[model samples]
Structure formats: structure tokens, C-alpha cells
Target: HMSGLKKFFPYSTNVLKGAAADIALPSLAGKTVFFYFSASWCPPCRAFTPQLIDFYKAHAEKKNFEVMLISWDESAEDFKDYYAKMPWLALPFEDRKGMEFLTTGFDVKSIPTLVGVEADSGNIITTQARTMVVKDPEAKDFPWPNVEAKK
Candidate 1:
């Protein structure tokens, strides 16, 4: 059943949200998916996380977009608390198997990396979505019309 999300999360069906663990991967099919790579230990992530939450609240359902956390937390305790603050989904802390494909496969080198992908084709739209969330809080240029310029 790993149709669209298979390219990235090749090994799973369900993602997580605190204690709610039944969210299916296909729930995000045919949408814009953002893989947020971060950790509670990262200072910069703390600053950016709120803005992401705001962006999610504003645009998610309306635009058919989804954000999934790819946590770098050293412990499940850290991820549990940090992820609770996000109003989105996440690759479960106990299931870090897909983290490598998201990090090394995408060549993500830093924390707070926001990688956006087109669900239909599984092609990367942009890896610098964090910049957009911060610079365009209103999301006037949503999905970043100039992703080619940034990439």
C-alpha cells in the first residue's frame, strides 16, 4: 500500500501524532508532503517549529498539504514531548528506519530542514521550505512558485 509515500517512507503504512497512531500513509496521498527534519536538541529548530505549526494550521487542510516530522531526537521521551506541540504527523520515534532515506537520500545536512515533495510523482519540489514559512508567513507565494530559482 506504499504507493506515493513509498519513495520516501518505503517501509511503513502508519505515521504518528502523540498517542494517535492509526493515521494511514495514504491519508496524505495526492497532496504536497513536507518532511520536517528536526530535533528538540537543536536550538534553531525550536525557533522555527512554531512558524511551521502556524503555517500548517493555516494551509494544511485547505491546500491538501501534509507535514511529517523526521525526528533526530536522541530519545523517545524527547520526540514525544516535542512532537506533541506539532499539529501534524510524524515518522514514529520508535520507527527511525526511514530517517536515512530522508536525510542521506535527500542529502539533508542541517537541522530544521523542510523538504517538500509532490505526492503524485514523488518528485522533490523544494528543500528550503523553511525559508518560505518564515519569509512568507501569509503564504502569498504558496508551494513556492519559484522553487526552480531556489533549487
Candidate 2:
């Protein structure tokens, strides 16, 4: 699984700055990885952040779900401030190039976008993950395969 995310993460652990518990990229094996593209400066993102947090807190362990923040915040301070509120791991603020790779690779054009990728295969499961999170909060249909249809 590390091979899938190695180009972006590049490190043994993908951790938020100064946060404890180093999360190895390889640990994401056999899990659904959600790349959450968001910003503290965006009002819409601010609103949705808590919802995702709540959902993460409830089902993360049980579902073997993992989230990685790809922040769109303008400043490192802002990125840290916003990321502190999240219980998941995040891409470092200094890794702007890697962030660009993820953003462009996913074709993310907006804030608060959640892209679900199958960790083992490194294949995108859904680009509309945010919609599924909102529409199916309990995640009865976890991973939402319907949205994976070819465009």
C-alpha cells in the first residue's frame, strides 16, 4: 500500500505537524483512504469539517477507514490550526508539490472535496465521496461504489 501513496507521502509516516502517533503509509493497506481536500478559509469547508469529524470518530476504526487531509489553506499557521481539529492524519504544509500532485491527479477544483481511493490498488473509488458522506451519513453504503462509474 505504501507504493500506492509513496510518491505523495514519501515518508514512513504521514503525520500532521507536531502530532503524536505516526501513521505509516503502509498501514493503509486493505483500507479505504479518503483524501479530504479542504481549507480553513473556506466557509463551506468550515461547515462540513465537523460533520466529517463526527463520522470519522464513529466509524474509522470499525470500518478500517482512514482520512488524509490535503489542506487548501493559504498559510502554514492556518493549516495547522484547522488540522488540529481533525483526528486524522494530514499531508505536511511544506509539501506543496505533493499537494499539487494529489489535487491535479484527483481533478479537485473545489474545497471540501473527499476522494476515496482503494489503498491496495491505488485506484480511485469515488470522487464524489463528500456527497456520499452527506447523503449516507451512517455510511450504510460505505465506499459508495455507484459513483465510481466511468464519466
Candidate 3:
């Protein structure tokens, strides 16, 4: 269960490609979903990626996790180049059509934000917005330890 602070306001919006779109936070169902917001041009993001990759690999077989990357790059090419180096799935940058919805919905003002959500329910487990990737490799505040996967 999530505290009320984690709930998204009903009216929050997402902007994709500069167009307004409803913020449709995907359901991870039986898995833990990590919503990652970052960009290729960000220096700290580049460094923190490897750790996230390692964490994914370590937990890959657990059948309990997934990652959704939302990039804020200046161009689609940059997004692709960054995606090429990552092992996770990323939302299309051209899909900025939902950017406003995301920004307003999540109340995010900085890059490299990480939001953890429960898949079965559209509840946000945690919102670690404004996290400096390089500074928090372990992401100690992540909701991992609190989650128990039922088999």
C-alpha cells in the first residue's frame, strides 16, 4: 500500500512531443516497475546507468522487476544512442507528446528522477525525484527491501 503522498492527482497531465496527453502510468502487474527519467547529455546519468544495469541483472531471474526509461534528450538520435547502451526499455523521446502530462503529473522539475511503482495497482511506491545518479549508486531509498513478491 502507498501513502497518500504517493498518489498522483487526477488532473495531472503528460506532455509528449510538446502535445498534451493523459498521464497513463503503465501497470507492471506482478512485477516491480522502476520509472527512470534521465537524458544522455547528463553526466551523472551516464555514470549511474551501469549500476542500475547491474541491479537489473542481479534481479533479472526473480521475475519481480522491470524498468521503464523516460529520456529528456534534445533529439531522438541522442535518445537512441543512449538507449543503445542500456539494457532496459525506454519510452520514445519523440513521444514528448506526453511530456507535459509527465511533468505535471509527477511534479518533476529536475532530470534523473526515479519513481518506483507497484505493477498490480497503479500505486506509486516511492518517488525519488531529483536523485543524483552518481551520488546514490545503491539507491538506498528504493522500495526494494519493502517489496515481497508472492509466488
Candidate 4:
């Protein structure tokens, strides 16, 4: 289904500099992709950032995974500031075209939703399940340790 995303968004894969810069979606042809839907003003997103940062830091260089943070709020300034503090990629704040495709295609209803997909085949391995962590801190480490497909 995501093969259709490239046609609708037409975003460059080039990484942009500075706060809230445009980050190209890495070639997911043979890697795992983590699609993180978030916004700066959302308190839940703010709270989750640090943990995600830690996770990203732990795995970003391994080359097995890539993270694309899609913003739902306005203001590139705000997004840039937040991006400065993050280690992963932030889709351009002005990527309304990509955002529209994601929102409608994935049926996203709220902020701070995490979707894990298999890059090679554009298959959704996990969807909207990690948001449960916001309401329950004790919810495992998210994605569950026993999920064999994940590393």
C-alpha cells in the first residue's frame, strides 16, 4: 500500500539541515521502517520523545531500521525546535501532502501513534498499538519483546 505513498507525496529523500528540516524517507526496500506520527504542542508527544530518542540512539546506526516522524501540527519553527533535540528523522513540517496520505491511508486519529512496517515489502507489521503506552506506563516496552519478526 505504501508504494502508493511515493506517488502522492513526491518528497525528496535528501536530509535537510537545521531544526525541523526536511528528512528524506530512507530507502525501505530491505529495512524496517518506523512511522511515528506526532506534533510539538502535544503533551503526550513531548513526554514520549525522550524514550523514543533513547531507543533511536540505541539502534539508529545499526542500519536495520529507520524512523520517519510525521507531524500533524502547524508551524515549522516549533517542529524544528523539537527536531533539534531528536536523533531520528522528522518529515518536513510542511509535508502536508505526505501527511494527508498518511492520515487518510492509515486512518490516523490521534497524535503520538507509532506504526512499524516492513520496508522491503511495504507491509504493516504493527499499527496504532503502541499508543496504549500513553495510558498505561506498564505496558511492556511496546512492540512486545516476544514479537519474533522484530529485532
* Model 4 CA deviation exceeding 4 Å by range: 1-27, 61-63, 129-151
Instruction: Write model 4 residue lDDT over 1-151, tens digit each, in one string.
Output: 3463344356544444444444444444566667788888899899887877666565555636667777887787777787777666666666678777777777778878787766555666666545433433444354432243444
List candidate 1 segments past 4 Å from native: 145-148
Better of 1 and 3 by lDDT: 1
Write the residue-wise lDDT of candidate 1 on 11-60 in tens digits: 66677866788888667768998899999999999999988888888888
Q: Write the per-residue lDDT of candidate 3 for residues 75-124, one digit (tens) a residue.
A: 98887678778766555565675555566677767767777766566566
Question: Which candidate number has the best TM-score?
Answer: 1
Provide the RMSD of all predictions against the true structure, rounded to 1 decimal. Answer: 1.8, 2.4, 8.1, 5.4
As a TM-score, model 3 comes out at 0.67
The TM-score of candidate 2 is 0.89
**Sort by lDDT, best first: what order?**
1, 2, 4, 3
Deviation from truth (RMSD, Å), model 1: 1.8
Ranking by TM-score: 1, 2, 4, 3
Tell me each candidate's TM-score: 0.90, 0.89, 0.67, 0.71
What does candidate 4 score on TM? 0.71
Cα lDDT, model 2, residue 135:
83
Clashes of each: 0, 0, 17, 2
Structure candidate 1, residue pairs in collision: none
Q: Pairs clashing in candidate 4?
A: 19-80, 20-80
Error of 3 at 118 (Å): 1.2
